[PDB]
Symmetry: C5
Subunit: 96 residues, 5 copies
């Protein structure tokens, strides 16, 4: 049980690996601050072995964060559709 | 612990099997992007044997995703009432 | 770990028993579609022994579902105040 | 694992004790019916030893319930700021 | 399993240590009472080592609390951007 987190900037897929005999457990997703205040809804994706899964759609006004239980035992990528800001993903790494 | 997820397109029941001595744990539901300004509320169902259970009602305006804990040890189907878009279900498989 | 769920129709108490050395874990609650556009908040109860406990208040407009963690080791009843529709309760049974 | 719940009526702290080598796990909080009036936000507190902690703020309009994971290993008190109604807390007791 | 909680006043980082062979599990976040209207965004952070992670953005009107699952095995800091009030964080400590 080790705290884990990342900031995905401007949506470009961030490729991650839990490591041998580990899982990443993502528990918290948060929409970062806007520089402009042109806010469209922002889609969030986890890509695992190809399959690209929508996990949610955030907005500053209505959906600025999610409490989640996403469990990843293999290489994956996090990505989102906001070209001008960050989405924060956090949780913890687990053994076995 | 194996990441798992599916896209249910246009609501047609997707029949799934966790596998022998496995469970599917569904943790995240997300509503896909709409192509038009018709938004009807979209009902989501898990059908197990003779029981069709409503798990929720989504909309782009108010309810575009759910964080869930749905546990399936036997064959089931996922379905929804949106004839013109997708709902994404994700989570993980567990060994017994 | 066995998927479990029920439909409580028109609010009448549904009396249930987890069984010997079993638990019912209720993880998802969902408000059925309305035919009868009166609307009003719908209170949901779990009755265990002499205690009738409110678990929440649903509406089609604002609160059409809940994600819960309700654990029941002994006989109980589910009930709600909607006389003209259903509320769906689902989750799983656990041994030991 | 035993179902547990209480109704905290009006503004008075309810003092509770899990017992020796037990925990209370609070998983669901629900605001009781207001008998007409539109009411003010209601703050919820758990008091443990030297700490009175805000756990949230409920309203009939916007926040009538919470799904929680509050874990108490020693004597505590639940209280809230609604002088003329109830808040229901439920979950389960765990033996260590 | 020991109840844990803190009040972070006016945003100033609170530096905390779970202790040897312990984790802090943060389950509940709640926004304190405002005396006026707050116009500044209320952003919440957990800082661990070189990573400052946004966990969400609170408001009195729309997002006065979060139910979370944040796990910390290391020294960390909690902080937020509300200059004129408190955010309450609670949960429990776990051994081993």
């Amino acid at each position: 049980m080790e705290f884990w987190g990342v900031e995905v900037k401007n949506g470009k897929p961030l490729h991650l690996d839990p490591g041998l005999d580990r899982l990443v457990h993502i528990s918290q997703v948060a929409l970062g601050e806007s520089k402009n205040n042109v806010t469209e809804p922002i889609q969030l994706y986890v890509t695992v072995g190809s399959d690209k899964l929508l996990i949610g759609t955030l907005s500053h006004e209505k959906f600025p964060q999610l409490s989640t239980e996403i469990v990843l035992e293999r290489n994956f990528a996090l990505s989102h559709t906001w070209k001008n800001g960050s989405v924060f993903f956090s949780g913890y790494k687990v053994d076995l």
